[PDB]
Design a protein around this nucleic acid. Structure first.
Lengths: 331, 80, 297, 242, 325, 326
RNA sequence: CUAAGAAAUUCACGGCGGGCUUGAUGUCCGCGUCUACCUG
């Protein structure tokens, strides 16, 4: 009868390492192994009251009294060294492969039909359409999340470390490659076939990614925050691995899989991140609404159960949602 | 595992570690490392029932170590 | 009831697996009726040979760890259990449990004997301490010594020696080795003062004791409920008419407990060290049996 | 059975048979179960936090114990109860210091940089509880003064236990970093192994008295009786170390 | 005649904890002091993507629930950012004396059981269980998730006799497959060593180390613990460590004698062969191929099972356990 | 035999603390750190028998979808040190035959006569020869003995803060179920027999090293104890170190009885009235059999039939372990 | 002469897959540390 699997979860592919942030001068790019680390340090601030007060408590004698006592926070920040201008971000990405084989299913016929459908998908077309888009989000350095805007020239640079040595190197320039269109270059197809053979499974792929962003002398980089769970106050603690400021290994990699252009009301508003009920919090709302039939769950249950194969512009989405992993069972 | 307020909303969610959000000023105090719960729209406040404590209101009133959660939180369903 | 003459002190009595229940109502430190009877057993085994007389004990309780756990539930505690051997059928046993405790005390005794002149003042403490490393004192064994530094040497002080300044100097010269414990003494005074203050609602004595430990109010120390002896209800029997007694020479009286309250002082803020020697007042005139510490304050 | 005998005043012994009381364990079972959960517990639960029923109390119940009677065999004993499968409570009578925490004695800043730091649970409770007696006890000279003087004496006497508890805690607090703040008072609350090398420093408690009893703590008992108790503590600290 | 009311078997093949560390490749015989991979907190928030029970399948509520975030504070274990090698070291103690249970009730049961086990042992050795307990150390199947997607896994096995070594073994855990049970000129030596270790003919204890060339700064995985944070990891002395019995569960994956199908590879030897991952239970008791109806149909009614199932019914005893209710 | 007669125990042992240090460094075994009780948490499947109403293939697979979650404790050697040091202090008491419970005093003195005519013609040197074997081979090392490469036990006589005489055995060449002669074990047995006969305690401090392996498991004694958390297998810790119980040493000292009617090739069994094994279940020396302790007391002191010397050894060893009889 | 006397709890275990924590901020202003001293 092939009912839906009660418990189903998937191991991910495309793992990113943790991101490291170093600092230096732009002319010393090609010898930047021993650049010092962008350290985190504490500073103090002093705010005011800048929130929308309600209609009741808009008394004149209370607002000046509330701002007479300000709120003295203690913020952590990260600045580049005052003699350095170029921010170096280094992280390594490994490509696992075997995207169909799940982690913990229940029915054997569900698992076998799932692997059969995924084998048909890899048989008719390659992963080439789902690898000319991951290679873009390595090229135009979206993984620099807020450090990208207002940068002078963003040179990203990617190596193939098969052994301890490098196999074949690549340099791009992340502003020649736009943040919206997916072009077709001669050195985004030697990279895309590499991630294609890594995801299909015909080898092992480990990629070293460094990204130099030109921000300026003494400027302010942005690493990712943490939690301030439970006076001695503090706010906005950044995340540093061994006192070197760091982007998380899921904020990086979240920019690896903003691939999804195939979704309704697409008004040229750019790709979003792939998700079941494909949603972004920054836009507030959730696209791929389940009342539409262009979801993920009701796209898998109409392809592994009733075999109604959707358009190839959604089979590029379902497989990519399988590549990020996740839980998919009736929890 | 508590005795909440009089909200009869739905199968609530609860945690004890609580951070304060500032961005998005219609929701305050977003909850951290949160755990699921089910009372399945029971009548009174004490029904929390994580894995073991459903009946025995005397034992529930004995279970006052981490109790009296206020409930007024990010959502009428979601509790403290 | 009379005055001591020599404060014989035992240096460090490590105890293993001693009793912890000690009444129908407490569970803490073992009943100091055991410490009362322990030195009478010690005198009965030694004090006739060295010609001495022992009456009072103090307790210091260097440490105390019970055997309790909580099975992811209440803040009340359950106890330790011992596996029992099989019966004749070899199936199971009707197991009855009791608490345990690793307590570590060092008692100080009280000597009345004339035998301090013929025997030297260190032989009489080198024999008594050597005897009491072969006997039980609450239901647990007494442990020997490891191979480290040795506070296993005891002392033997005479309170009659020296003047008042010399007495208060050797008192500190004894208390300097006894400091990290907590001496425990009777507190029979304030109960029969707290009674008439609490006589408006209910005069039941167990209720007065039960709310002397349960904004919040004030406790003027570390009050504690202890057994304080036995009230008797059955009359005297004959020595040789009762069935299933430990002997057939003494009469018998059935008894219930008698609960009082004590105090866990520090060794410093006591007046002197003749104030905490646990005697046992034992009026049998259709009466009872107690064990207290006179000159308590 | 289980019977004892006690010595008479100047005679032989009397055998005593201590039985199990029942009519005086059920009364404390009733008077203790209701304060755990009941009218006084459920109603006026918040009686001292948010203004509940004023003529009631809180009725705390620390460190209780429980003791079973075989489990699933409730026919042997008498006076049965279906809730009582060995469900008679036990009040505590524990001697204190039954945790044994004062082990490390490190080169910190609270108790290692300052002598009168005293970062302990009982010391912190005694420090927090002296505010009710540290008020204007003008008509409470035995209340804000006598109880305050007794609590000051208790907080002073606890320092001897907080120091000598590490009296065998090591072969000696040697030359190390951070403990130089405790090196200003490295005789009294410090190891043993002539005033400096052949003597201890019996004046650093006078320096720690301003931090503990002055910094953390009417004007008579705040300086006269506290000063006399500090002088007694200094005499006790000086009479021992030499 | 009957089976016993209590019956217990202490385990053999006892493994240690497995300690983790990291460093660089091309460092052979100098890898004694590598720093331990420490765990650390790390905050993570990612929005709701589980299934829905066709009750909140409405756009009025999904946008409301997408704005209630789900801040968690998980742990993680990464290598040092210049270190691309994960070293797992653990010590395995093979006791021997397989048949003798630690407890019983009827001695007429017990000597019959020892008779059956001794007839098995002198009939055919422990060699077929030994050649299968070696290939869960030749290919490092104890590197559970840290194995998949690795450049070159290599295990080195040192048999210790005194404080010093006795024999040293270099393997290559990818040429030795995860599926087929080969026959090499050096796996037979480790095989017969654990054969002599299980037959009571000595006592063997091995120190086994595993190098997994993961990737510099990449992620490795320890065993994960219970909850009373939202993902706790196992730290022995502030060092990340796989569990002991998890190494045990990887070590006894020798069972390739299902009722079902030989085309899916081995699993871990259980009474009811019940992999919790795949959620199904091979060797169902409704079929006559489980363990509990292969014991009392071999030692009470005394019909022998086939020569394949004898290996499984002994290997279920080497894992030990409690039987006979 | 009148109403009550009870014997305070002799051969009283103590707890056994643990430590973990290397080999060829066991001489310095005073500063070795403890072996503490860390915890872990395990996810178990189902491995018990089921009923005939059970074992349908639907309820079984629905059971392995919810495995049990339990948080056991464990204790391991630290991952550099391979040798386990266990340390315990045994004291004997002496005055074996004298009880402390008698309301007869004509039974008491004839009991004294019977134990006196037992001790005069032959000493304690047969029970002592087995009490020394139960410290030579480390039977008190209960589960940690098996599989170790070389157990080595050390025994110190202590009378004052000095040590008096130090022994050094090897618990592997010494068998586990035999009782042979030895040039040192006879002297040790004579020491403990001199302790058992006369008054005043004769004290012993025994340590034992076991070469298990790097970071392996050890097994201290467990402790007896809402199916949600379910912390099972709580070990025993005193002053934060994994401790074997006192009684667990007591059941390994008195493994001396090798005079059973049922089996004499199995090995010794701990002495017991209605002599029973908790593991083997069945109680040897049944009361229907005439080889019971309590029959052999009244036959030897009331009707005064002297049994065989083996049963005399058994009843006097049973008096050594103490007990209570009504 | 001690609520004294007495006591083996044991065996075995897969926690496990997934994730964007974002945005902004003025810490201000005033000040006396003095007096002495034998290291052989």
């Amino acid at each position: 009868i092939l009912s839906t699997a009660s418990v189903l979860a998937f191991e991910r592919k495309l793992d990113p390492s943790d991101a490291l942030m170093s600092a230096g001068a732009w002319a010393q790019r090609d010898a930047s192994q021993e650049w010092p680390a962008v350290t985190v340090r504490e500073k103090s601030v002093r705010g005011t009251i800048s929130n929308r007060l309600k209609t009741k408590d808009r008394d004149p004698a209370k607002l000046d009294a509330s701002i007479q006592s300000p709120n003295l926070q203690t913020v952590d920040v990260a600045n580049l060294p005052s003699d350095a201008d170029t921010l170096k971000v280094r992280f390594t990405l490994r490509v696992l492969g075997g995207a169909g084989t799940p982690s913990a299913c229940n029915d054997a016929a569900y698992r076998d039909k799932l692997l059969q459908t995924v084998a048909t998908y890899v048989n008719d077309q390659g992963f080439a359409e789902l690898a000319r888009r991951y290679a873009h989000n390595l090229a135009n350095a979206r993984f620099l999340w807020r450090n990208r805007v207002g940068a002078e020239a963003v040179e990203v640079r990617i190596n193939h470390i098969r052994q301890g040595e490098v196999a074949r190197a690549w340099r791009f320039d992340a502003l020649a490659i736009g943040l919206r269109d997916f072009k077709a270059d001669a050195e985004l197809d030697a990279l895309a076939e590499l991630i294609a053979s890594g995801l299909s499974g015909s080898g092992h792929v480990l990629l070293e990614v460094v990204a130099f962003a030109r921000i300026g002398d003494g400027q302010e980089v942005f690493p990712s925050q943490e939690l301030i769970l439970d006076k001695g106050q503090k706010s906005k603690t950044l995340y540093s691995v061994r006192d070197a400021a760091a982007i998380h290994s899921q904020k990086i990699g979240n920019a690896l899989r903003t691939i999804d252009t195939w979704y309704p009301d697409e008004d040229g508003l750019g790709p979003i991140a792939v998700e079941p009920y494909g949603s972004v919090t920054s836009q507030g709302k959730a696209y791929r609404q389940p009342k539409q039939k262009l979801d993920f769950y009701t796209l898998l249950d109409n392809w592994v159960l009733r075999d109604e194969a959707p358009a190839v512009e959604q089979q590029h989405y379902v497989i990519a949602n399988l590549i990020r992993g996740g839980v998919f069972g009736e929890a | 595992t508590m005795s909440t307020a009089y909200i009869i909303f739905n199968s609530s969610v609860a945690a004890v570690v609580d951070t304060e959000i500032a961005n998005g000023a219609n929701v305050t105090f977003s909850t951290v490392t949160v755990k699921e719960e089910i009372n399945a729209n029971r009548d009174f406040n004490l029904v929390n029932a994580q894995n073991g404590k459903i009946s025995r209101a005397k034992r529930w009133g004995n279970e006052a170590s981490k109790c009296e959660y206020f409930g007024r939180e990010i959502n009428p369903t979601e509790f403290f | 009831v009379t005055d001591p003459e020599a404060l014989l002190l035992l240096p460090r009595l490590s105890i293993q697996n001693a009793n912890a229940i000690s009444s129908p109502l407490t569970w803490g430190f073992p009943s100091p009726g055991a410490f009362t009877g322990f030195v009478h057993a010690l005198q009965r085994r030694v004090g006739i040979s060295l010609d001495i007389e022992l009456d009072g004990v103090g307790i210091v309780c260097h440490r105390f760890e019970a055997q309790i756990s909580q099975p992811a539930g209440k803040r009340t505690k359950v106890f330790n259990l011992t596996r029992n051997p099989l019966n004749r059928d070899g199936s199971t046993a009707a197991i009855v449990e009791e608490g345990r405790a690793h307590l570590e005390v060092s008692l100080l005794l009280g000597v009345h004997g004339d035998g301090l002149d013929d025997h030297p003042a260190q032989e009489i403490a080198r024999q008594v301490q050597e005897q009491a490393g072969a006997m039980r004192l609450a239901g647990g064994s007494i442990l020997p010594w490891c191979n480290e530094r040795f506070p296993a040497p005891n002392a033997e002080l005479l309170m009659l020696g020296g003047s008042d300044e010399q007495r208060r100097k050797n008192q500190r010269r004894l208390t300097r080795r006894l400091l990290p414990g907590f001496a425990l003494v009777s507190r029979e005074a304030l109960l029969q003062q707290h009674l008439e203050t609490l006589r408006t609602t209910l005069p039941e004595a167990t209720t007065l004791d039960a709310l002397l430990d349960l904004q919040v109010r004030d406790k003027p120390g570390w009050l504690v409920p202890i057994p304080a002896g036995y009230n008797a209800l059955s009359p005297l029997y004959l020595p040789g008419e009762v069935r299933n007694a430990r002997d057939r020479e003494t009469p018998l009286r059935f008894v219930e407990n008698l609960f009082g309250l004590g105090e866990w002082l520090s060794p410093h803020r006591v007046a002197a060290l003749s104030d905490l020697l646990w005697y046992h007042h034992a009026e049998p005139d259709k009466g009872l049996y107690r064990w207290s510490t006179p000159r308590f304050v | 059975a289980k019977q004892l005998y006690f010595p008479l005043p100047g005679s032989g012994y009397h055998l005593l048979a201590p039985l199990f009381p029942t009519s005086l364990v059920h009364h404390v079972h009733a008077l203790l179960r209701e304060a755990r959960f009941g009218d006084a517990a459920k109603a006026a639960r918040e009686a001292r936090s948010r203004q509940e029923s004023w003529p009631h109390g809180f009725s705390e119940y620390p460190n209780l114990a429980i003791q079973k009677f075989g489990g699933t065999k409730p026919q042997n004993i008498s006076q049965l109860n279906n809730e009582r499968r060995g469900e008679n409570w036990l009040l505590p009578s524990l001697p204190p210091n039954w945790q044994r925490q004062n082990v490390n004695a490190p080169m910190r800043h609270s108790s290692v940089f300052e002598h009168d730091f005293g970062r302990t649970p009982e010391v912190s409770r005694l420090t927090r509880t002296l505010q009710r007696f540290l008020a204007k006890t003008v008509h409470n000279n035995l209340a804000i003064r006598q109880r305050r003087a007794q609590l000051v004496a208790q907080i002073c006497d606890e320092a001897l236990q907080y120091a000598a508890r590490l009296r065998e805690l090591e072969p000696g607090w040697s030359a190390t970093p951070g403990c130089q703040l405790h090196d200003a008072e490295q005789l009294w609350l410090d190891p043993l192994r002539q005033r400096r090398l052949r003597g201890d420093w019996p004046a650093e408690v006078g320096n720690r008295f301003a931090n503990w009893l002055n910094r953390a703590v009417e004007a008579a008992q705040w300086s006269q009786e506290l000063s006399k108790e500090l002088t007694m503590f200094k005499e006790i600290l000086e009479d021992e170390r030499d």
